[model samples]
Target chain A: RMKQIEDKLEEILSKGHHICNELARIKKLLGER
Target chain B: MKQIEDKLEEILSKGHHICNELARIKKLL
Candidate 1:
């Protein structure tokens, strides 16, 4: 059960990386800062 | 147990990279 929870958490963080990629890309495109 | 440890290392590393990227974005936008 603990391993299963860890696996799920890992998947969630992996998805977070993808979201960060998009955030970085859009920030570059907009030049908002 | 070791695999979980190894995986945690990568997870933290990725988290830091993502954090840095977000900080970089803060500077950009």
Candidate 2:
């Protein structure tokens, strides 16, 4: 059960990183416009 | 296990907040 939670946490961390990058990219795009 | 569960919940909440921010940004775009 702990391992499963750890795995899910890792997945969420990866997704969080992706979302942060996307947010930065879009914010930059908006700034340009 | 309880601490782990709390940590998981915290991360999940952060993830949800980020997702909401992403949706708002998409609307702007």
Candidate 3:
């Protein structure tokens, strides 16, 4: 059970990193405009 | 047990921060 929770948390963190990177890209685009 | 709780708290905090960031960006758009 604990292992499953840890796995889920890791997955969420991975998705969060992707969102953060995408946001950074969007911010850069706004900056250029 | 405690470690799992800590990790959950940390993830919640990070998600909250990201939400605020996205909100700020939405205002810009």
Candidate 4:
């Protein structure tokens, strides 16, 4: 089965979510000007 | 087969690239 690497994929997906949120904060700061 | 690891690496690499692109756009904005 492919279950082992499924967890890694999920982990990377969550990492992407965290990265996206951080980028959104940067955009918000840029809007303050 | 161990092909899944390579595929996940590709996904992560592409995701990271988009992450960098977003940062670049944010800096320009």
Best by DockQ: 4
**lDDT score at residue B10, model 1, on the 0-100 scale:** 64
* Model 1: residue B16 alpha-carbon error in angstroms: 4.6
Query: Model 4 over residues A1-33: C-alpha lDDT tens digits?
Result: 345455555566568867656655555555555
Tens-digit lDDT track of model 2 for A1-33: 655655665566568777666655554555554
Specify the highest-lDDT model's number.
2
TM-score of candidate 4 relative to the true fold: 0.49
Model 3 interface CAPRI class = incorrect
Residue ranges of candidate 4 with Cα displaced over 4 Å:
B1-29
TM-score of chain A of each: 0.80, 0.93, 0.94, 0.80
Worst 10 residues of 3 chain A by lDDT: A24-33
Alpha-carbon error at A27 in model 1, in Å?
0.3
TM-score, per-candidate, Cα-based? 0.49, 0.53, 0.54, 0.49
TM-score of 1: 0.49
What local lDDT score does residue A6 receive in model 4, on the 0 to 100 scale? 54
Tens-digit per-residue lDDT, B1-29, candidate 4: 23444555556567678766655554454
The lDDT of model 1 is 0.59
Give the candidates in order of TM-score, highest first: 3, 2, 1, 4
Collision pairs in model 2: none
